[PDB]
Design a protein around this ligand. Sequence first.
Ligand SMILES: Nc1ncnc2c1ncn2[C@@H]1O[C@H](COP(=O)(O)OP(=O)(O)O)[C@@H](O)[C@H]1O
Ligand SMILES: Nc1ncnc2c1ncn2[C@@H]1O[C@H](COP(=O)(O)OP(=O)(O)O)[C@@H](O)[C@H]1O
Ligand SMILES: C[As](C)(=O)[O-]
Ligand SMILES: [Mn+2]
Ligand SMILES: [Mn+2]
Lengths: 235, 235
Amino acid sequence: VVPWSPPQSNWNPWTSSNIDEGPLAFATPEQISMDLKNELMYQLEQDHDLQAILQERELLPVKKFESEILEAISQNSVVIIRGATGCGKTTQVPQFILDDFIQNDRAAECNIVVTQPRRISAVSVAERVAFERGEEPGKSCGYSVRFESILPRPHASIMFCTVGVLLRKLEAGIRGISHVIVDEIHERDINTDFLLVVLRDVVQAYPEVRIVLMSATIDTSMFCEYFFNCPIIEV
Amino acid sequence: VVPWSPPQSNWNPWTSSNIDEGPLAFATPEQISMDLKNELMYQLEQDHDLQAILQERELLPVKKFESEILEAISQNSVVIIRGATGCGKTTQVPQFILDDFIQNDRAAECNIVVTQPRRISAVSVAERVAFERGEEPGKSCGYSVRFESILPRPHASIMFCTVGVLLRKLEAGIRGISHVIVDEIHERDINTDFLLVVLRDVVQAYPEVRIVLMSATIDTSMFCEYFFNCPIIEV
Ligand SMILES: Nc1ncnc2c1ncn2[C@@H]1O[C@H](COP(=O)(O)OP(=O)(O)O)[C@@H](O)[C@H]1O
Ligand SMILES: Nc1ncnc2c1ncn2[C@@H]1O[C@H](COP(=O)(O)OP(=O)(O)O)[C@@H](O)[C@H]1O
Ligand SMILES: C[As](C)(=O)[O-]
Ligand SMILES: [Mn+2]
Ligand SMILES: [Mn+2]
């Protein structure tokens, strides 16, 4: 079984290396958390376009359940979220988790990898999410696919990737990732199904990891059974 | 990686030990293969009940494609076999492979494991193929499931089993098995998909091995593409 530990201040989980150069070489988590809460406040009070996007975001179907989800993920090692295409699972849930950590002064304690079924999706979704936070990829949002990657920043960040990348990484280790999200599970894929076996081993060794599986269809019982009749949350 | 070698005259792949029972325990392959070709040829002449059954087999849709399938498998590490259910994939293909080896003085060079998606199919199929061969289970055919098994003879034989039984075997290795057949791949299943990954690793280290994937008429592209754009035999 592979090695894992929670996020640390002077560890970059995306480049899997100590941080030795730069401000964060010595910054404290409280400092990092406080810093990033303030940078959200500022980006709002300067980018006028951003307030309209957040407004378009409040309107999506999944927003009703922001609390049910955070709570369920926070209390359970594995959680299934399911619901029809168009609710906002893909583009919003990662953000709900991130923002929940930023607002409650916990931004240092959060990094999220999210898998997608295809190269296109890993990239377009990373762009989209960066766009919804008024950024370009590279800051709070990155991606990594075969041959091409714009890694996000070291802290309080989300990296989208193909399953291939994430499997290749699970060899070295996923030190410092707090959340792994497998999106579009309903789409049959071999490596993805294999990824679930590895992730299931990881959870057994490391209860404090958070796994979220996300389906567009009702056929979730196969996965629910595989992860010890874990919670299903409707959206 | 998993250990593997071709079948050897002294080795029983099913009990994973040296052969200490039956005829020609210590003989050469050339000798074992003659014996078995003779034993089959004779059985045909004497069992008139078996001759009715062979005519019944002759009419199955899959019969037509016998040569095409054998040629495809002999020339490729992996093959996929696709066809309407009822067609004869499950009950015949293993026999076509066995009988090709027996008939061309190679009986000793053939041992076939076949996975099924349910314990009951493993057994029911094993028992049916034994019947289409005028035998009880335990000679050219057997099975192995969690808690019960009737193992077949060590040479020129087929064992049916569950995906789990095989995954456990692959931990210790599958030395002496010439063909691995995964049946009913269209039935999505996590462990079955895990198996395919592992089998892909085997094929890379051991191109001499044969993998045969069997499917109802669905979109097999995903499999074809996982196994290096391998053939697809339409049936
Ligand atoms: N790249 C995009 N461009 C414009 N609108 C988008 C884009 N991605 C998502 N959206 C909007 O946000 C909605 C949510 O999609 P998504 O987050 O993928 O939800 P789900 O995962 O539940 O299908 C879409 O229905 C669409 O209206
Ligand atoms: N246990 C059995 N008893 C009698 N006939 C059988 C039995 N199993 C299979 N058959 C016959 O052989 C045919 C093919 O079975 P099978 O090899 O499972 O086809 P496939 O795998 O292509 O769906 C069936 O349509 C049936 O007529
Ligand atoms: C019972 As008989 C003659 O088919 O082996
Ligand atoms: Mn989605
Ligand atoms: Mn079948």
